[PDB]
Write a protein that binds this DNA or RNA. Structure first.
Ligand SMILES: [Ca+2]
Lengths: 112, 110
DNA sequence: CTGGGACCATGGTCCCAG
DNA sequence: CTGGGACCATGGTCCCAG
C-alpha cells in the first residue's frame, strides 16, 4: 500500500491547509480513526534522511515511525546526525534491515 | 495478487501441477511460511457460493477462511445450504457485514 | 514433510474524560 | 476538541514432535 510516511505527508498537508488543523474533521473526511492520522502524520515528521535508511519507505511502520518521532522529540539533531552518521556506513556497503534500522537509531539515546 | 481467496487458487495451481503437492516446496518458492500457504489454499477450498456472500473477496481473511474450511470439513453439504439462506436474507433487505457472516456460517455448526 | 501453537507488530477502533 | 490506553483480528514467522 502507500507508505505510512507518505500517507502522513499527505494527511499533514490536508490537515494543515484544508482543515484548519481540526484532526477530528480530517479523520472524518477520510473515514479513518483519528489516531491513525496521528501516527502517520508523526512518522512524516521524521527527517527524509531517516526514511531513506529503509530499503522501501513501506519498511517503516506507522507505529514504529510515530514511536521514533516521539523518542527523539527535542533531540531532532541527534536523530539527524545519528542517521547521516549511519548513512555513511550504508554507502560503505554495510547493510541492515528495517528491524535493526530503528534500533541502531535509538541506540545513541541508550547507555551501552 | 491481493485477495486471500484468490491466492488460495493461485497457490493451489503451483502446488498441484508444479510441486507434486509438496507444500514445503512452493513455500520456499515464494519465500513465505507454510502456514500462510495452508491458510490461503484452505480458504480457496471453500464453496464459491460462500465467498460470493461477502461484499468483496478481500473481506474474507485467510485466517478466518482457513478457519471456516475447517469448521466444515466433511459437512460441506451443510455450508451451501447454510449460505444459500444467507443469500435470500441479504436479498430481502437484511444487510450483514464481514464478521457477522462468519458467525452465521459457524452458528449452525454448534 | 506437516499442522498445531505460542508469539509478534501492525493497522485499526473505540472509549475515557479534561 | 484531544491523546492515552485497552482491545481486536490480521498476516506472518518460528519452534515442536509425529
Ligand atoms: Ca464519514
Amino acid at each position: 500500500p502507500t507508505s505510512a510516511y507518505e500517507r502522513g505527508q499527505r494527511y499533514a498537508s490536508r490537515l494543515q491547509n484544508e482543515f484548519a488543523g481540526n484532526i477530528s474533521a480530517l479523520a472524518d473526511a477520510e473515514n479513518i480513526s483519528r489516531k491513525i492520522i496521528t501516527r502517520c502524520i508523526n512518522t512524516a515528521k521524521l527527517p527524509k534522511s531517516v526514511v531513506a535508511l529503509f530499503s522501501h519507505p513501506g519498511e517503516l511502520s506507522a507505529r514504529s515511525g510515530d514511536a521514533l518521532q516521539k523518542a527523539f522529540t527535542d533531540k531532532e539533531e541527534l536523530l539527524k546526525q545519528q542517521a547521516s552518521n549511519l548513512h555513511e556506513q550504508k554507502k560503505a556497503g554495510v547493510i541492515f534491515e528495517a528491524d535493526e534500522v530503528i534500533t541502531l537509531l535509538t541506540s545513541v539515546l541508550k547507555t551501552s
